[PDB]
Design a protein around this motif. Sequence first.
Motif, PDB file in Angstrom:
ATOM      1  N   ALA A 184      -5.212  80.306  24.357  1.00  0.00           N
ATOM      2  CA  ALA A 184      -4.675  78.980  24.624  1.00  0.00           C
ATOM      3  C   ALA A 184      -4.248  78.331  23.313  1.00  0.00           C
ATOM      4  N   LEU A 185      -3.028  77.798  23.287  1.00  0.00           N
ATOM      5  CA  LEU A 185      -2.486  77.119  22.117  1.00  0.00           C
ATOM      6  C   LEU A 185      -2.013  75.734  22.527  1.00  0.00           C
ATOM      7  N   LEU A 186      -2.455  74.713  21.796  1.00  0.00           N
ATOM      8  CA  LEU A 186      -2.163  73.329  22.135  1.00  0.00           C
ATOM      9  C   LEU A 186      -1.477  72.629  20.968  1.00  0.00           C
ATOM     10  N   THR A 187      -0.753  71.561  21.298  1.00  0.00           N
ATOM     11  CA  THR A 187      -0.097  70.698  20.327  1.00  0.00           C
ATOM     12  C   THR A 187      -0.593  69.268  20.505  1.00  0.00           C
ATOM     13  N   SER A 188      -0.464  68.473  19.446  1.00  0.00           N
ATOM     14  CA  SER A 188      -0.994  67.118  19.445  1.00  0.00           C
ATOM     15  C   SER A 188      -0.017  66.172  18.763  1.00  0.00           C
ATOM     16  N   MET A 189      -0.074  64.906  19.164  1.00  0.00           N
ATOM     17  CA  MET A 189       0.667  63.849  18.489  1.00  0.00           C
ATOM     18  C   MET A 189      -0.021  63.504  17.176  1.00  0.00           C
ATOM     19  N   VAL A 190       0.764  63.127  16.170  1.00  0.00           N
ATOM     20  CA  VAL A 190       0.243  62.753  14.861  1.00  0.00           C
ATOM     21  C   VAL A 190       0.803  61.388  14.491  1.00  0.00           C
ATOM     22  N   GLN A 191      -0.066  60.502  14.010  1.00  0.00           N
ATOM     23  CA  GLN A 191       0.324  59.165  13.588  1.00  0.00           C
ATOM     24  C   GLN A 191      -0.045  58.956  12.126  1.00  0.00           C
ATOM     25  N   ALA A 192       0.690  58.062  11.468  1.00  0.00           N
ATOM     26  CA  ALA A 192       0.476  57.748  10.064  1.00  0.00           C
ATOM     27  C   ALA A 192       0.466  56.238   9.882  1.00  0.00           C
ATOM     28  N   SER A 193      -0.030  55.802   8.726  1.00  0.00           N
ATOM     29  CA  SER A 193      -0.130  54.377   8.444  1.00  0.00           C
ATOM     30  C   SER A 193       1.259  53.773   8.276  1.00  0.00           C
ATOM     31  N   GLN A 194       1.489  52.637   8.930  1.00  0.00           N
ATOM     32  CA  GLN A 194       2.777  51.960   8.897  1.00  0.00           C
ATOM     33  C   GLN A 194       2.578  50.496   8.539  1.00  0.00           C
ATOM     34  N   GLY A 195       3.445  49.987   7.663  1.00  0.00           N
ATOM     35  CA  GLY A 195       3.379  48.612   7.225  1.00  0.00           C
ATOM     36  C   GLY A 195       4.348  47.713   7.980  1.00  0.00           C
ATOM     37  N   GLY A 196       4.323  46.434   7.607  1.00  0.00           N
ATOM     38  CA  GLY A 196       5.165  45.429   8.212  1.00  0.00           C
ATOM     39  C   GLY A 196       6.073  44.757   7.196  1.00  0.00           C
ATOM     40  N   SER A 197       6.907  43.860   7.712  1.00  0.00           N
ATOM     41  CA  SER A 197       7.842  43.130   6.872  1.00  0.00           C
ATOM     42  C   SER A 197       7.131  41.991   6.147  1.00  0.00           C
ATOM     43  N   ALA A 198       7.753  41.532   5.068  1.00  0.00           N
ATOM     44  CA  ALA A 198       7.239  40.428   4.272  1.00  0.00           C
ATOM     45  C   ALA A 198       8.044  39.161   4.547  1.00  0.00           C
ATOM     46  N   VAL A 199       7.546  38.046   4.019  1.00  0.00           N
ATOM     47  CA  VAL A 199       8.178  36.744   4.187  1.00  0.00           C
ATOM     48  C   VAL A 199       8.533  36.191   2.815  1.00  0.00           C
ATOM     49  N   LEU A 200       9.733  35.651   2.706  1.00  0.00           N
ATOM     50  CA  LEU A 200      10.247  35.016   1.507  1.00  0.00           C
ATOM     51  C   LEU A 200      10.173  33.504   1.640  1.00  0.00           C
ATOM     52  N   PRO A 201      10.262  32.769   0.532  1.00  0.00           N
ATOM     53  CA  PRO A 201      10.404  31.314   0.639  1.00  0.00           C
ATOM     54  C   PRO A 201      11.681  30.962   1.385  1.00  0.00           C
TER      55      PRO A 201
END
Lengths: 49, 48
Positions: free
Chosen positions: A24-41
């Motif tokens: 039996a051979l299986l596959t899996s989903m992989v996730q990584a760290s993701q950031g967000g947008s910044a705010v300017l004046p």
Amino acid sequence: RHNLSIDGQPLSLAIYAEPTDPKALLTSMVQASQGGSAVLPGTLSLYRF
Amino acid sequence: PVMLERTRNLVAQLTQFGTSLLSMAEHDDADELTTLLLQQGMELATQS
């Protein structure tokens, strides 16, 4: 001497230890760290709210 | 009348959110069924 009959037929049934099943051979989903947008004046608008 | 106009715009946007929420759930659950069929198919393939 080699445990054969007069005709050459072997006298002992052999064995081979049947190969171990499918695999039996299986596959899996992989996730990584993701950031967000910044705010300017902010700019000062010319119009009211 | 001014309060009614501002409130009515907000409620319409809230309705928009509800429609998107239901639509996404429908698509996600359809993909769940497809994934389940493939996983079940693989078990059948091993026995075949």
